[PDB]
Amino acid sequence: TSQVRQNYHQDSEAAINRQINLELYASYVYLSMSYYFDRDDVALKNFAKYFLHQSHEEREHAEKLMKLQNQRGGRIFLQDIKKPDCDDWESGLNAMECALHLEKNVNQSLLELHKLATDKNDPHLCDFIETHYLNEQVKAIKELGDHVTNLRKMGAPESGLAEYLFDKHTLG
Amino acid sequence: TSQVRQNYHQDSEAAINRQINLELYASYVYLSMSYYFDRDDVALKNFAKYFLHQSHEEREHAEKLMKLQNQRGGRIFLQDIKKPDCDDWESGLNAMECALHLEKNVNQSLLELHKLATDKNDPHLCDFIETHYLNEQVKAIKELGDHVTNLRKMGAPESGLAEYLFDKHTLG
Amino acid sequence: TSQVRQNYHQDSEAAINRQINLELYASYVYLSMSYYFDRDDVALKNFAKYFLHQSHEEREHAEKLMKLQNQRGGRIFLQDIKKPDCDDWESGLNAMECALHLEKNVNQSLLELHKLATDKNDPHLCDFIETHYLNEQVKAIKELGDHVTNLRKMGAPESGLAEYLFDKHTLG
Amino acid sequence: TSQVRQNYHQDSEAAINRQINLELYASYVYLSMSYYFDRDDVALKNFAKYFLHQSHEEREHAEKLMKLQNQRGGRIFLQDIKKPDCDDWESGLNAMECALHLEKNVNQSLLELHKLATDKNDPHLCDFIETHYLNEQVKAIKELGDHVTNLRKMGAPESGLAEYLFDKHTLG
Amino acid sequence: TSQVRQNYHQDSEAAINRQINLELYASYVYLSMSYYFDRDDVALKNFAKYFLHQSHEEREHAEKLMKLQNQRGGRIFLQDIKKPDCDDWESGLNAMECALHLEKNVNQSLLELHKLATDKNDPHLCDFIETHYLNEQVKAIKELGDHVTNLRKMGAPESGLAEYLFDKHTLG
Amino acid sequence: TSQVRQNYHQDSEAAINRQINLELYASYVYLSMSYYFDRDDVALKNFAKYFLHQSHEEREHAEKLMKLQNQRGGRIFLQDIKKPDCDDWESGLNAMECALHLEKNVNQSLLELHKLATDKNDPHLCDFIETHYLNEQVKAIKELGDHVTNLRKMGAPESGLAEYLFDKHTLG
Secondary structure (H helix, E strand, C coil): CCCCCCCCCCCHHHHHHHHHHHHHHHHHHHHHHHHHCCCCCCCCHHHHHHHHHHHHHHHHHHHHHHHHHHHCCCCCCCCCECCCCCCCCCCHHHHHHHHHHHHHHHHHHHHHHHHHHHHCCCHHHHHHHHHHCHHHHHHHHHHHHHHHHHHHHHCCCCCHHHHHHHHHHHHC | CCCCCCCCCCCHHHHHHHHHHHHHHHHHHHHHHHHHCCCCCCCCHHHHHHHHHHHHHHHHHHHHHHHHHHHCCCCCCCCCECCCCCCCCCCHHHHHHHHHHHHHHHHHHHHHHHHHHHHCCCHHHHHHHHHHCHHHHHHHHHHHHHHHHHHHHHCCCCCHHHHHHHHHHHHC | CCCCCCCCCCCHHHHHHHHHHHHHHHHHHHHHHHHHCCCCCCCCHHHHHHHHHHHHHHHHHHHHHHHHHHHCCCCCCCCCECCCCCCCCCCHHHHHHHHHHHHHHHHHHHHHHHHHHHHCCCHHHHHHHHHHCHHHHHHHHHHHHHHHHHHHHHCCCCCHHHHHHHHHHHHC | CCCCCCCCCCCHHHHHHHHHHHHHHHHHHHHHHHHHCCCCCCCCHHHHHHHHHHHHHHHHHHHHHHHHHHHCCCCCCCCCECCCCCCCCCCHHHHHHHHHHHHHHHHHHHHHHHHHHHHCCCHHHHHHHHHHCHHHHHHHHHHHHHHHHHHHHHCCCCCHHHHHHHHHHHHC | CCCCCCCCCCCHHHHHHHHHHHHHHHHHHHHHHHHHCCCCCCCCHHHHHHHHHHHHHHHHHHHHHHHHHHHCCCCCCCCCECCCCCCCCCCHHHHHHHHHHHHHHHHHHHHHHHHHHHHCCCHHHHHHHHHHCHHHHHHHHHHHHHHHHHHHHHCCCCCHHHHHHHHHHHHC | CCCCCCCCCCCHHHHHHHHHHHHHHHHHHHHHHHHHCCCCCCCCHHHHHHHHHHHHHHHHHHHHHHHHHHHCCCCCCCCCECCCCCCCCCCHHHHHHHHHHHHHHHHHHHHHHHHHHHHCCCHHHHHHHHHHCHHHHHHHHHHHHHHHHHHHHHCCCCCHHHHHHHHHHHHC
């Protein structure tokens, strides 16, 4: 038993390690997409720069939890990382959906985590997640919410011209 | 027999002169294209600046070999330069294809050249071509690989609007 | 079959995907170590900054191959990532050994890869790995070679004072 | 028939294409000389820089006509380029003569061209060649006129010392 | 047996030590020449600055190998250094020849070394010598190739005036 | 007989050449040490930078005499250079001793040289060595005098910790 451990219940320590594992899995997914659009048969450049940029941050989140895990004197158990579900994402529009479909799952997990954090009556963990995460995932959803709408309204995938113009006048 | 000639076999000296002649022929082709798009019946400006810019570099390659040819104390025999195959390139998309169709031939020649350079066991020529060329032609192919794809996906040549917008939002 | 594929044999494409998977696995290992030394029961700070810094680069290597994989028009198959072998690294000195023990395996794989790259007579892949990797792994080994020696000679782990002083006067 | 064609007679369009072909042929000649003096058995450096520099400009002339050819809405037919006459130029002095012998031929052609341009009563073509060319070829001749004289008076080729000193104190 | 030794065969380690010994011997030769031209009975100043400058670099080469020898965990055996062959070099022109005669021997040795490096299938040593040496010795030969030619053509040694003027207008 | 030779006796000219040969031999010794400490089984970095730095200066001394040898119009005879005595120096402390043991021999030779310079009554050579050497070798001895003492007092070689700390807090 560590000397700095105070008011930290052995249940949460099992929850975080499921949270962290989820993060890295997410960051591993984007990495797969961001190089898919670099293939010569698709060749939308900025999508690479956009998604690849996502990957770096979701890593830092994952890194940031581990930094917290020690501050309360917990331990770190790591599990294996699963590969993505689908290798061929097949189009720009279809890509964002699964991406959007990914975030809400992540946001879904955190809600239960704050709920669990209330029962044990650990305030420090309440306010923490009330700060560095919940406020972020909202803005991320809203942003992807738009890009999905615009492409659908513009007529993609059916007209490739929609995808191309959307590249330069938004992500440029 | 020159005084600086060492471990340089009389076979390669016949290969280079076929390589150099190929280069200038290439640089002479681009020159024809880059002024074709300047005609008033086509009038896509940046294509001129793009291809004309290609011409200058493929010349330097050709120039760079000759600078090597003397460093090993070889000789330089020049042959005549053939005109291009087709004068009317007829469209933007059709232009890139023959252009792409041109590079792979050039890349095809160099491979055999490095192969020949291995048999005679001349290391200097191995590492040289392993450096200043093979790595370039790859990136050139990949680049033209994209521009072909985008235009085809955007619906050119059939819709001229595809070609025009592609001018400003890429080569600008 | 892609349009840019030239002189790229279907065997290598299966080798790279085993190489890439190895890299990410490596970068995932360091990540585990670099936060192990942050625990309050060990608390050697710079080791964190040192290993964490390693992790970022070995990622870029992994990223750099994928960038090559498309330039030759291959494909990318991803597998799952295994967890590290040992969670408790137990000491500073014992940490470096397994770390050093890790690199030589990586260097061992690349040698066979260049060997395989010679049989198919693909020059581009020869000179590439002859450049951006083989020269790096040497310097990395030599560096870890020293740090292992110094600690052993200074009398660590048996005297913790050896580890501590070695922190500030080297990694600072 | 192009829409911008005005007062441009089908005879001149056949003359220009003989003019352009002549230019590139000239620029291809200098290129051969400028690397001849780089051989180790001659090794006069600045001659390389001097002639190589000539090559670039005579190219621009050739390029400049084509830019005129479209402004009047003509067409561009390209022919093959002949190799130079003599591969071994054998000495510095003998080199300049054939070079000087080359220019006057070029100047000879333009005179007939302006003469032909007067008969058809095309003013635009009169004043053009009266400007960007005729005034240049004069100064070029006069310059080479001197270098021939100085070397002959100094006693070259018979005394190599004449050639060498002439390198540094003139072209430097 | 060192801990960092990997895929390094005991034959090469015997070759390098013959290579290094050759280098220092070379650097010791130039040193003798560069002070020979300082004698009052010859008194060509810049030759001193030129050759003395050569000596410093060929030392660094020698130093650079030793820095490689440890990176692969070899050992270093040093032998004695022989004095030069001829003390009185007797003239400027005759000096360069023996100098040129020296380099090609050095270049001759390296070729066999890369050949030996291919049999053992050590890639790291292949690409290394393919880089930091073979490309240098070429340019060095070509340079001395010229200076020999110019002096011979100018009429040295027979006319001392040739040597003197060649000092200021080249090495200055 | 040279024209600038004045009051320079044929005995000294034989002494200098024994002095110069001694210098280069010294500079060749340090070179061996300074790369010995770079081996992975020792790995004390600054010792390399320290001794390697010594080598450069003792070379300049050797170079400086030769520049004197001509000013009096002597001649230069070079002999072969012997290899060092012991390849494995085995420890830091033991290294300095043989190093210190080396200098005093050098200082021992110069004393006899100034003594010989007094008999022939050559003042120029008296004051010269009274200046650029004798005052240097003193300070060099005193410096190595300390480093030997400190290590011995600190308990090296027996405690490696002594050597290591002495690296950073002195030669850094």
